[PDB]
Amino acid sequence: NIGAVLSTRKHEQMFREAVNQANKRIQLNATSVTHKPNAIQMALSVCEDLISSQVYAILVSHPPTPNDHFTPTPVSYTAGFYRIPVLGLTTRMSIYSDKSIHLSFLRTVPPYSHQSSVWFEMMRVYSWNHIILLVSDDHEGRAAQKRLETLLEESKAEKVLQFDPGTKNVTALLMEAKELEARVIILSASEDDAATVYRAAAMLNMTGSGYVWLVGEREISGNALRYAPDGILGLQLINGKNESAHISDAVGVVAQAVHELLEKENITDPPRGCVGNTNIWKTGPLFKRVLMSSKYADGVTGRVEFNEDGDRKFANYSIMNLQNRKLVQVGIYNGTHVIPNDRKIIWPGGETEKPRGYQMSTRLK
């Protein structure tokens, strides 16, 4: 309904193509497109663009900055200040869903706090027992640990649950894990923290000695793989690698929501100027409810089903095993079920069979 917002020229072209496709198939009006590389400047730039567009429609993607921590935060705050629901493309961050501070900051790609159901299904299929989970000191790690604990309540095991802020010298967690004698561990943190954990595990001579575990999608990066050993069963998004596909789905969802809301006669007029925005939007909750209720049968991302918090229940993730410093996609789990037997999983130790989680536990205090 408003002008498209994108970071790069290719993203702008993709957004324009998606808008044209939506208009070809209740009309989207656009006047100009603008963006800023600085978050502080972008906070005012997005407000100015929304004011000039005379419409409430904001949908941006994540910047290519390596940090990817607080660059889109001011834009999200500006979008959530009013009653203007927004949709994020290729924005997999669990910080937004950890506290739900924003009004309707919904992303098609599930955040890092999700995918614990896939881990639970894998553990049930492989009958894994006596596993521990390490969560980063950030809010995203705490939320992921809480979700995993909630989904593991039939039991689980005595997880270390170390804070792990990301210090250079961190050996207490490794010592505790060795003492607990847990074959399967679940670690999810930042790239630097994951690299430090892998280095500590390698220095302990226990990374590939009868210990086979799995890792999340947060640490899936080239830098982490350069130091991590083989035999790691990481997770990857089904279609989150490229953002050129989610833009079409977002445009279609926005068009469907606009068509659904056009029936209602309580449509408000956004202010022409940003300064003259004393009035508070009141139809925003209704639009958010309509968007949550509305769903797409198919598309680039397939079936989309918003959860209670507003997260798409795609439940699709590809499991990649590490062998000879190479990633092999041995099937993919869709709908939180078993994955196809594309390739045989090989443990880092060298045994084809999955080692038992509760093994080598005789002495007790």
Binding site: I40, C47, P74, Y77, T78
Partner: protein, 388 residues
């Protein structure tokens, strides 16, 4: 020293006079005097005012005040700290309210109690009322897990044990029918929640609901269908004036700056008046600004945005769209003039008569009594009720 300013969206002309009249015996460098006046509710105007203040002089911290009920503006103020690495102070209105899980690297100070403080106040009120919740009902809201965790921690720490227990919500309310009900939802959801409660019957004189700040932020235009008897917790709704709050904030900022200068020997200053001026030394002053003492009262606070001695008030909604301002929370102490709250009212005279009434002492640990006794309004030779 500090180029703080007060923005009123209301005149507050006495704030500058109070700040100037404040002594600087313990202050190393006298602060700069600057005031910014604007009437807008947009991020662009706030950004322009901040840029103008930074260009005029070194702010190193600003105080924001507002008259609207939009608390989210305070959250934007937190982002302002992320754009300046400087503390932001609140006086009244949106800035007074404290957001949920707003703690981050950027420093932010608010005069409103957090979720944990509100839960503690509600628990103290329920202990004074000698009633128990015995019913768990929480709607889908961002401030849900924190409130439940705080309530669980409070009931676990407390020596006295606590009982634990449109069609779906009505059935849940009927199954969990209790005289004390805790709820947290938005006003739009509260409109249907009140109707559901009235239909079920908990809105009558058989149960009471507690909505501290979720809906009853300002109970001046309460709906007619809203049941009478509910109470709310506010942060100096009609007790602390805006100029007084501004003066207290200025004094706290000056004391924090003096402490930082004493502990670091180098007062930080903004690089320039640009958006990315400080994009290139900020935690040193934040680590000392938390322990701030001014006006003969320590204002120590944590990253959650609480108060060491909050001026919490209790408003009791009535059937005539009126709320009682009686209630104080000085020095984290519980006291009120309506402790005994409700031809169903009777007065019974009771004497000692040895074994029939042998209890004559009240536990001073919290001012309450046991779970198998009653209050006894003894004579003045005022209303100091003991345990019977």
């Amino acid at each position: 020293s500090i180029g703080i300013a007060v923005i009123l969206v209301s005149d507050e002309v006495a704030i500058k006079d109070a700040h100037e009249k404040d002594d600087f015996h313990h202050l190393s460098v006298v602060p700069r005097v600057e005031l910014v006046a604007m009437n807008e509710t947009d991020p662009k105007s706030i950004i322009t005012r901040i840029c103008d203040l930074m260009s005029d002089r070194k702010i190193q911290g600003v105080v924001f005040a507002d008259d609207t009920d939009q608390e989210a503006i305070a959250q934007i103020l937190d982002f302002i700290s992320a754009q300046t690495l400087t503390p932001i102070l609140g006086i009244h209105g949106g800035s007074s309210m404290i957001m949920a899980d707003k703690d981050e690297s950027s420093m932010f100070f608010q005069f409103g109690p957090s979720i944990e403080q509100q839960a503690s106040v509600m628990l103290n009120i329920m202990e004074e009322y000698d009633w128990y919740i015995f019913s768990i009902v929480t709607t889908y809201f961002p401030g849900y897990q924190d409130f439940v965790n705080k309530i669980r921690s409070t009931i676990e720490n407390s020596f006295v044990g606590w009982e634990l227990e449109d069609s779906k919500i009505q059935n849940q309310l009927k199954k969990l029918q209790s005289p004390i009900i805790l709820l947290y939802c938005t006003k739009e959801e509260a409109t249907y929640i009140f109707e559901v409660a009235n239909s079920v019957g908990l809105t009558g004189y058989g149960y009471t609901w507690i909505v501290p700040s979720l809906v009853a932020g300002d109970t001046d235009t309460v709906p007619a269908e809203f049941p009478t008897g509910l109470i709310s917790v506010s942060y100096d709704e009609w007790d602390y004036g805006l100029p007084a709050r501004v003066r207290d904030g200025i004094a706290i900022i000056t004391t924090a700056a003096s402490d930082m200068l004493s502990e670091h020997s180098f007062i930080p200053e903004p690089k320039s008046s640009c958006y990315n001026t400080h994009e290139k030394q900020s935690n040193m002053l934040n680590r000392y600004l938390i322990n701030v003492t001014f006006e003969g009262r320590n204002l120590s606070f944590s990253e959650d945005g609480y108060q060491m001695h909050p001026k919490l008030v209790i408003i009791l909604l009535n059937k005539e769209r009126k709320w009682e301002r009686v209630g104080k929370w000085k020095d984290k102490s519980l006291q009120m003039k309506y402790y005994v709250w409700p031809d169903d009212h009777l007065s019974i005279v009771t004497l000692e008569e040895a074994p029939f009434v042998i209890v004559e002492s009240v536990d001073p640990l919290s001012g309450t009594c046991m779970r198998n006794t009653v209050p006894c309004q003894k004579r003045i030779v005022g209303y100091i009720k003991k345990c019977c």
